[PDB]
Structure formats: C-alpha cells, structure tokens
Symmetry: C2
Subunit: 206 residues, 2 copies
Amino acid sequence: RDVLTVGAVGTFTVGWLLPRLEDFQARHPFIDLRLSTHNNRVDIAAEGLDYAIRFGGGAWHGTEALALFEAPLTVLCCPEVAAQLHSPADLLQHTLLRSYRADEWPLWFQAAGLPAHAPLTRSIVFDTSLAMLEAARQGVGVALAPAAMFARQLASESIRRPFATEVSTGSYWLTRLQSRGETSAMLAFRGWLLEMAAVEARGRLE
Amino acid sequence: DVLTVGAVGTFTVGWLLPRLEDFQARHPFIDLRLSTHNNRVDIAAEGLDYAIRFGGGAWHGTEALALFEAPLTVLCCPEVAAQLHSPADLLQHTLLRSYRADEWPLWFQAAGLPATRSIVFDTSLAMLEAARQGVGVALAPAAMFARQLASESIRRPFATEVSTGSYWLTRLQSRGETSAMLAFRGWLLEMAAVEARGRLE
C-alpha cells in the first residue's frame, strides 16, 4: 500500500539513481519502493518488476521503453596508465577492457579518427561497467564506459579521462512489459524519474 | 590455443585478476578469454570451458572443484561504523541484501541475535559501492574487498562472520578437459591453496 518494484542496471543504480532516490522518498512517502539491481539482461516477468531501467537502443520485444538520456562512451583508466597515453594510437599497447557489446571499441576508434579495430586479445569482457572500472582502477587495462556514471570517481580524481573523444551507442531507458497496466505508484515514479532525467540531459549541453 | 573462463565478477576483480599476470607468465602461449557474469550462468549456452561460481558445489551436470570458502561479514562506510556499537544497532540502517535467499538471518543467528525495507543487489560489487556512498550496511565476503578495507574507505565493524558457500571451478561433465584447461586448473588450485592457508595463518 502501495508497492512499487523497480529493477535497474547496477551501474545506473550506484552511479546515478541512488544519489537522487532520497528526493523521491521525500516527495512520495507513501510509496514502498523495492529496488533491485541487474546486469542488463533483466527479465521483467521472472523478477517480478513493475519497471526495469536498462541500457541500449530502446527496442526490446514486448516492451514499452521511455528514453531517459544518452550515455556516450569514453576511455577511462587509472592515472598510472593515463600518463603513458599521448595519442589514442597508444591504446593498442594496453589491455582493452570491453563489454559484451562487441562493436563499442571499433565505433570509438572511428570517432577518434582511427581504423575500426577490432579488439580480440588482448582483452577481457565484462558483464557490468562497475566490474570494468574496478579492473581499470587496479591497472589491469583501459576501460570504455559512460563517463556520466562514474562522475564521483572522476571528480575525486580516482580515475582519469585521457581523451576528449566520445561515441554515442545507447541510452538509458525506463521499460515496462506491454502486457501490464501502469499502476498509480508506477505513474508517480515515472513522473519523478523523467523530471530528474531531464535535468541530466539538460546538464550535458550545459 | 584458446581457453574461455567465465568468472563471477566480484571474484574476478577482487581476487583473480591481480594474480593472472603470474599465470600468463608461466604459460605465455595460452590465449585466455576471460569473461564475467553475475553467478547465474548456463555453461553450455555461454560456450565456456570453465565457469567460476559462488555456492554449494552441487550444480547438475557439472564437475565442481572447490577453491576456498567465502564467509560473509558486515561492511559499511566510516561514519555508519562509528554509529555501530553492537549488532542490534544494525536495524537502524537499511540492510543491503544480495539476491540470495537469504544471508542476513544466518548472520544474525551467528552473532547471537534472534529473528528495514531495502535493496537487493545482483553483484556484491554494486552492493559495496552503495555501502561506500552511505546508502546502507552491506553483508559480503570481506576477502573480495581487501583493497577497500586496506585504505579504510570500507570498515568491518564486527568480528562475526557466517559461511554460506564457497567459490568453485565448474565444468560440464560433457566436454573434454583441454590441455590449456588442465594447466589453468593446476595453476588456479595452487593459487587457491595459498589463499585458504592464509586464512588459518
């Protein structure tokens, strides 16, 4: 009375949602929110979610998806490794940490004005950017991830952005099953989340 | 000469990656394809030689070799740790939970306590980052967060721990042990014995 269950990708939950969720609970004291995290293969029905927030193109079968904001990808690494990089061409001297989406590194090299390499060895594939950024922190390799999800780390200087080049491969989306009606707590949560998302998208042009 | 290992992500980053340089120095012509997952995997569907998982070692169709035990303890940021004097003080904070099913009861039990509304985490990695941010109090294997404890950005308020599972090297009984596999198996078991030894020591 009333129950609301939301699942979000872990990187989005700890990098973005949780810093703002105190605002939601103040403005909606009566909604009992059940937040869980997942790794972007979330199955709404199996986990009992009303909404799932995930990353990609917004065209998931059986799903209605509302765009929140873009998450452009950039190179992120430890200061150790950052000092050793002068041009993006130096990157092939390092382990390239990557996600299961295999075209992010060639897409980014393109955006940097380099051929569309194509990194199979040496490289390690990560289910979550959190695991990828922790590996990058520990000097294992060079990460390619959304800067806007690791703002704290960057502002604390605990990790570094060595280049300006970005590439836009996906957005964060609020998704829901077409099969299910939107409850009143769902509508309340959606309104608050869209407001917060608009401030974020607005901030990146600002 | 390829070898595909899929390891749960907390284990990969908190323990296996800092030691992999050794392996790559001792077998420089193995092409390891390391991937991570969230402990809920289908070895066949993902096409792995080995998976490394947390749990009880009894997954149907798979040969599971134990590595070491992973006892869970309470972990939080410095300020909330100061507010924590005894275990009963914990219910004053939000309990950060994993999708298991469930470990807080057993930990309470182990700390001599009897029988709020909170957050479930697919990975201890996400859980530990919320604990650093002050969102709540985590229950997770301290052995996987040596880095955060050494710098004291994360604190362990209580000595109580509770064993609920181990890390395991698993393989479908079906497909054959490759030579690259055998070499990884030997090296990993040696590295794991040092770790278990160290806990007693």
